[PDB]
């Protein structure tokens, strides 16, 4: 039956290969703890040298799970099974078990504390599966479930940014400043209706995806470079008068076949700006409605907006995604700098005659017939965004590679229930107490085997490009050394990306 | 029903014998305890007098039981009976149960330690029933389930050997170094799917064996020496001139008949080597492919090959197989040396005509029309070996007289559940916990007995052959002391070995 | 039209990490005990064996390495050389002519030189040391293997493994150059099929 | 993850040496490989658990 | 073309041993003995062993 020395599930992990879907099972062991002593806050963050960057926080008492990633999903044996062997996935539905619930009391004596649990108390899961909250959720971010399945999770505090500051600061007197101030929305998770657990109980939710596919395959030619060069053209092209050299109306030669298609849009103009703590980014997107005060430079308004280039070649490294393969990363030690597929659509340029020479246009706008890649995604990066609800919009491709959507897998919260003690003069006295217990994850995944007329050997994902680190520098990427610690990849290579092995026919 | 205060199972133990089969009940209990921080660990084991010898580990937190070993499962009593009466036995079904489970918080204030269970707490059990891990047991080590059913079992750590340290120790620049050590494969047991228990729930293991019969019969002859020795013989032999004395040609002689039979296998060749910290074997299997610098000695690459003498008469102690009764054996004392059956296929030899004498020649290869018996094995023998998978292989006989399979049972695997407490900065804090529980398994043999036409009486074990020891030396052997400590067998006699009692007419 | 039918045993595309010897827990410690005989000034010793060094039941795989390829190139030359000569005949010249010859002799052993590795041309017009593709160890631990035998000093390697009990290697690996089967000549009695060449007898 | 066999092993050879290996060169003549492993053998990709 | 290397071995058999001693003894040239321990040398293998 059920009860309290009855387990509600068991542990589930591994991967499932078939030619028609893929199934990625994981089971983490989790820790709540009690967040932001009950209550919500709103605070402002305001760093001193971020340049007049400054916002407010809405701090909640809830956590949140993270499941955005692809590293936490599939293992690096998985991962390189799947970008070898299949041209084509997209997560199809993702199952998520919360179970084997263990709520305790911590005793905090002194330098000892002691621990013991209480079978009574409870805790709260709220999954959001309308989006009637702001999003917990944000690519890129730290917070998701661990690589490794015996590593623990430790949930991330929820909290959203009700409005931008600077516009609401309301400093002297602004008619504008005190209408958006009044407007600024306050979400409390308890409106909703969820469900409290105890030891004994367990909660399951299911979620549907509507997506587009990741494609796999690579362009081995530019899309202009199609043709064969031996047939000659009809066309004519006219060279008007320069130097002394004379004009000239010629037919256009067999091997220089001009294209009907185009590079796809990027903007490579601009550059970072000011100091590290400031929000740095070439692009500022801002909002400054009317009204208020311009105050400090734009950082404080703005959001800011990167990778600028899209599918064009980055100048340099400003223009790269970089991230830090672990949080202890700092200073241009352990980042991870994106490098080029050497995929015919993926970097792209234009050049603009001057009738001496060519000159790269800095900034591509979006034009008619162009064609390129999506970024190609390792498993370090995320899986899915949250599309912004919004009347129009233009083509949907974040720049980061993951996949929009209107209806991302729903936010599960989570938060240590209340316990309240007597007090006599009237504080907010808690009890301490804490939950940890076993998330399992089952996503399913749908996948296409390629089929190739290509005569010639292609390029795969090998162990051989591994590197070898650790404190003895004798263990292999992907391991562990002798104090435990797990080798993470140096390069860009090491994280296995997609649109590499498989070619495709343009 | 079920419950925390109802227990799940109760003990069974003793054993039924049958003409057509015995069963073997045997239950104990165990202890789990936190293994390794709940971490994978990969470690060099370096000793300082090992001459070169090292290895590099990976240690996880994981434990496991080991049933491997005759004295766990047959009782003197019973294992006498076994060999007296019954002239083949293999194992047929083996069923465990794990039940009983008791989860206990330590709470270590000092000197003092208290002991506080928690019902919520749980504990991992996996079973590797494919063989998709390393396997966790070899045979001979000292891990094996207890012989006396009152004796707590101590799980001992799960750990495996992921490539051969000195290949991949990768110093300066080599290229296949550098690609062996990228290689190296990393298991944990977390990618399976498994149970998790609390301490009302309770599991069970089935195993099926396919095995070769384990043989009690005796030869009281060689196969050379069955003919009459009366009746003449046809055939004719050839002595060349040697010295003085001139050749001859004449009919051989009705009692010096020559077989057509041959002597088994066995290499007397080599003999160990070096310090006893070091691997010390006659023979060393090495694998060393090329490239890698040959850097110490071959006992760094080699594994070592022991007993190497087969079926040949050990020339010395170094080419017999011993062992030691208790983890307290040390240096010639307490160990038990193997001895000859008499029975005449067990030990056997081969001589070389010289024209003069006959020589002894050491090694004797595999060759057509031998005859030999497999190593007589006592109670302190493993029952099976894990016969490693490859496209090909020689005649099965692992000369420590174990039953090679290509699917053992099943290594079951078990892991105190990682309870993390919160911790202000990060760090890991585990809950100190441990789970004493009772395993039983009950193992299904199937039997022979023997019928014979020979008149007179045969060999039998007695008591009478048993030794007498103690702290007052009154006690006989497997029995226990005032102490309580048990009378362990001083020879191998007393460990009532196969292959003497029963007589066979070749 | 033609159809045919195979009766094959399976070709083998997985790797072994680590050799067979080498599979055990290094914490556990084991029962079994050793002796050292007496050799200098070092007494002899009876004691415990480390619970890195246990030691395997399993066996390196049968090879030949003893002999040298022999004469001019123009000649049959290989190290080991297969005659049949009834009786009678007279022996004329050497044994090249009366025999076949064997190689590759190495089997599973590592080849100590290029003479015991398999070579071969990739193209018809490849010529004297041109063109010519060498194989090399797949680095798979069953592949490649040695026997030492101890002195009570040093180990040495021995030239000659025969089969034996218990003896595991792999079959040679095999690339697209290679042949995919081979004719099984007809007889009483064999041992163990498996060609040095890779190929799948039938 | 574990070694596979991949084309970024081949050589690169021909008359004008720009041409890689299982491929043609200008003259029809198909670009053979150079060294044994650009043959692709067995027994090195997949890992077995003895 | 006319070398083409076998793949296929010869047979076994032991050829190294000569036959010993007088023809009323057992003579041949390979002696299989079993003298499992103990029990004192005393005579030539020939006692011991079949051949």
């Known amino acids: 039956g059920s009860g309290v020395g009855i387990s509600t599930g068991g542990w589930v992990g591994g991967s499932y290969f078939t030619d028609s879907y893929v199934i990625t099972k994981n089971t983490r062991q989790f820790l709540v703890k009690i967040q932001n002593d009950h209550k919500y806050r709103t605070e402002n963050i305001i760093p001193s040298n971020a340049g007049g960057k400054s916002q407010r926080c809405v701090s909640t008492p809830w956590s949140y799970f993270n499941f955005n990633q692809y590293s936490s999903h599939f293992s690096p044996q998985d991962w390189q099974r799947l970008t070898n062997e299949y041209k084509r996935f997209k997560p199809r539905k993702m199952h998520v078990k919360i179970y084997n619930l263990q709520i305790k009391q911590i005793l905090s004596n002194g330098a000892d504390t002691t621990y013991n649990n209480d079978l009574t108390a409870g805790v709260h899961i709220f999954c959001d599966g309308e989006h009637a909250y702001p999003n917990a959720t944000h690519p890129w971010d730290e917070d998701v479930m661990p690589e490794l399945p015996y590593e623990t999770w430790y ?21 504008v400043e005190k209408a958006i101030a009044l407007q600024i929305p306050f979400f409390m998770l308890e409106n909703s209706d969820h469900e409290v657990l105890r030891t004994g109980e367990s909660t399951e939710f299911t979620f549907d995806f509507d997506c587009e596919w990741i494609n796999n395959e690579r362009a081995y030619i530019p899309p202009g470079l199609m043709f064969n060069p031996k047939v000659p053209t009809r066309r ?9 050299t004379a004009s000239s109306n010629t037919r256009i030669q067999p091997y220089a076949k001009p294209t009907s298609w185009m590079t796809g849009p990027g903007l490579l103009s601009a550059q970072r700006v000011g100091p590290a703590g400031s929000d740095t980014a070439s692009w500022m997107v801002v909002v400054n409605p009317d009204g208020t005060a311009v105050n400090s430079g734009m950082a404080g308004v703005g959001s800011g907006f990167d990778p600028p280039s899209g599918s064009l070649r980055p100048t340099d490294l400003e223009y790269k995604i970089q991230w830090y393969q672990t949080p202890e990363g700092t200073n241009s030690d352990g980042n991870i700098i994106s490098n080029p597929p050497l995929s015919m659509l993926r970097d792209q340029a234009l050049y603009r005659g001057n009738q001496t020479t060519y000159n790269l246009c800095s900034d591509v706008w979006m034009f008619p017939n162009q064609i390129w890649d999506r970024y190609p995604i390792t498993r370090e990066n995320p899986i899915w965004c949250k599309k912004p609800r919004s009347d129009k919009n233009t083509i949907i491709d974040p720049f980061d590679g993951t996949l929009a959507m209107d209806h991302p897998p729903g936010t599960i919260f989570i938060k240590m229930a209340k316990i309240p003690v007597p007090s006599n003069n009237n504080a907010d006295s808690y009890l301490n107490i804490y939950c940890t217990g076993q998330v399992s994850c089952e996503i399913v995944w749908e996948v296409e085997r390629y089929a190739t007329k290509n005569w010639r050997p292609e390029r795969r994902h090998t162990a051989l490009g591994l590197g070898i680190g650790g404190e003895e520098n004798i263990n292999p990427t992907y391991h562990v050394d002798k104090n435990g610690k797990y080798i993470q990849p140096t390069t860009w290579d090491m994280c296995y990306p997609i649109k ?6 343009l």
């Open 155 to 175: 949930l991330f505090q929820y909290g959203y940014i009700p409005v931008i500051h600077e516009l609401a600061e309301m400093e002297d007197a602004n008619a």
């Open 236 to 244: 004519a092209q006219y060279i008007r008068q320069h130097g002394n």
């Open 500 to 505: 590499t092995n498989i070619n495709k026919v």
